[PDB]
């Protein structure tokens, strides 16, 4: 994990998170559970099947190997011939060993990006108001409904109406 | 025996001639569909 969101800031999965790939976990006075947002699950998705697509058709045009037969009297061409045809194979098993070993490497550290930067955007938007734990947790200090959660989930935090409340908090605290 | 073959192109002929150690042909071969094929090899049998 080059980016570290993958272990690092998040180490432990969520296994009741089965609707998407990236969401958010909302602890609040209305209760608790687990949501998606699917602007991050759908890029990934979309760019993880035109990579799979793509390793398929870059992967069209192959060498194809075609029966010879010789009469016991000419071996150089016979030799040629089978060195030629299995030396083409070993050129081709190496292109598709090779490429998928790469885009293995390209899936997860893509993965890496999205959940950081899924991260990074929250932490942008929640500033002041939250405290960073470690383990990507955000305690924030107003006391809204469960409907800021889903504001955090759709993008849109609007900073001044909360910051009142929060340096309000932030001088209660000191 | 060693036996020969040529290909005969429509209106084309081929003539023989010999006195002796001649293997006259019996049945020729039409060519009637060309397309692609291959001779493997193998010990298999039929599936169906
Ligand atoms: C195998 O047999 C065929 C047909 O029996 C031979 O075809 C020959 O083809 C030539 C060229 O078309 C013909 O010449 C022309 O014939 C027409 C009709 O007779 C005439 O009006 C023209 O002025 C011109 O002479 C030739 O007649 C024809 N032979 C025939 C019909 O018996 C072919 O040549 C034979 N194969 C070999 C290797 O000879
Ligand atoms: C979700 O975000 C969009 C962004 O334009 C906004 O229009 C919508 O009101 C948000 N959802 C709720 C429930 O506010």
Request: glycine share 8%; proline share 1%.
């Given at each position: 994990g080059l980016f570290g969101a993958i272990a690092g800031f998040i180490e432990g999965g969520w296994q009741?998170?089965?609707?998407?790939?990236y969401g958010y976990h909302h602890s609040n006075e209305q209760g608790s559970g687990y949501a998606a947002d699917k602007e991050s699950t759908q890029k990934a998705i979309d760019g993880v099947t035109n990579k799979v697509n793509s390793i398929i058709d870059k992967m069209n045009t192959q060498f194809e190997a075609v029966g010879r037969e010789f009469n016991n009297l000419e071996r150089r061409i016979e030799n040629l011939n089978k060195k030629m045809e299995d030396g083409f194979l070993d050129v081709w098993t190496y292109n598709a060993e090779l490429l998928v070993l790469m885009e293995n490497e390209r899936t997860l550290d893509f993965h890496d990006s999205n959940v950081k930067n899924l991260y990074d955007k929250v932490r942008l938007q929640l500033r002041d108001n939250a405290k960073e734990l470690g383990n990507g947790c955000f305690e924030f200090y107003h006391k809204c409904d469960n409907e800021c959660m889903e504001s955090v989930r759709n993008g849109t935090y609007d900073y001044p109406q909360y910051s009142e409340e929060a340096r309000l908090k932030r001088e209660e605290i000191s | 025996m060693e036996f020969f073959w040529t290909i005969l192109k429509p209106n084309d002929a081929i003539n023989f001639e010999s006195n002796g150690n001649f293997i006259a042909p019996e049945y020729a071969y039409k060519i009637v569909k060309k397309g692609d094929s291959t001779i493997m090899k193998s010990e298999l049998e039929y599936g169906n």
């Amino acid at each position: 994990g080059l980016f570290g969101a993958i272990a690092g800031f998040i180490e432990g999965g969520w296994q009741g998170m089965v609707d998407g790939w990236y969401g958010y976990h909302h602890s609040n006075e209305q209760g608790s559970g687990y949501a998606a947002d699917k602007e991050s699950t759908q890029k990934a998705i979309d760019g993880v099947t035109n990579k799979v697509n793509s390793i398929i058709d870059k992967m069209n045009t192959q060498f194809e190997a075609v029966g010879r037969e010789f009469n016991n009297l000419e071996r150089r061409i016979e030799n040629l011939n089978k060195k030629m045809e299995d030396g083409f194979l070993d050129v081709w098993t190496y292109n598709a060993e090779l490429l998928v070993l790469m885009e293995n490497e390209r899936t997860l550290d893509f993965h890496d990006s999205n959940v950081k930067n899924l991260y990074d955007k929250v932490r942008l938007q929640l500033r002041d108001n939250a405290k960073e734990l470690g383990n990507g947790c955000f305690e924030f200090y107003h006391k809204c409904d469960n409907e800021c959660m889903e504001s955090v989930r759709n993008g849109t935090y609007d900073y001044p109406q909360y910051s009142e409340e929060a340096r309000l908090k932030r001088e209660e605290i000191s | 025996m060693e036996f020969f073959w040529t290909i005969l192109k429509p209106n084309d002929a081929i003539n023989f001639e010999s006195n002796g150690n001649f293997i006259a042909p019996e049945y020729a071969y039409k060519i009637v569909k060309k397309g692609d094929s291959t001779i493997m090899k193998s010990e298999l049998e039929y599936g169906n």
